[PDB]
Amino acid sequence: NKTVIKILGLKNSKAASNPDGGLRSLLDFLERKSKEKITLGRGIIDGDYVWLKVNKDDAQHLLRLNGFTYAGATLTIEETNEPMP
Amino acid sequence: KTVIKILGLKNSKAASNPDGGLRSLLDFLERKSKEKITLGRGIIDGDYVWLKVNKDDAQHLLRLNGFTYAGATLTIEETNEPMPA
Secondary structure: EEEEEEEEEOOOOOHHHHHOHHHHHHHHHHHHHHHHOOOOOOEEOOOOOEEEEEHHHHHHHHOOOOOOEOOOOOOEEEEOOOOOO | OEEEEEEOOOOOHHOOOOOOOOHHHHHHHHHHHOOOOOOOOEEEEEEEEEEEHHHHHHHHHHHHOOOOOOOEEEEEEEEOOOOOO
16 A cells, blocks of 8 residues: 655755755655665655655665765655645 | 664554653563563664664564564564664
């Protein structure tokens, strides 16, 4: 089944000044870093978080990337049963 | 010494505990291993539980990978990641 992932720290990063807030570049970075071949299509920014809806296997791959540094900011990745905003 | 990462406590019923269910989890791990293991240093960081243990202890903990605790599937893994302060 599907799962919701929250990513924190993009706003604090250097990528934040981008037109889209650095959203796509973040998702692109996550795809490269996992090396499991994760595919991130749609993501959104609500509040300080970046929200992703993914399958169970994908969720584990993202959680592995927790604590990595992106654009000069530490990424915090969390699984949640919260409804997608 | 070895570092162990545990995932799935947040999804469990013990998550609502005062200490996040850390103590109940470690208590469960000690009993389930049947080695009469003593778990010294542990912490909750993000969705993960971190444990610092000797090598033989790690093997018994690793056997419990995939087991269900408090209604949540546990993913137990060894890592060379530094333990967070």
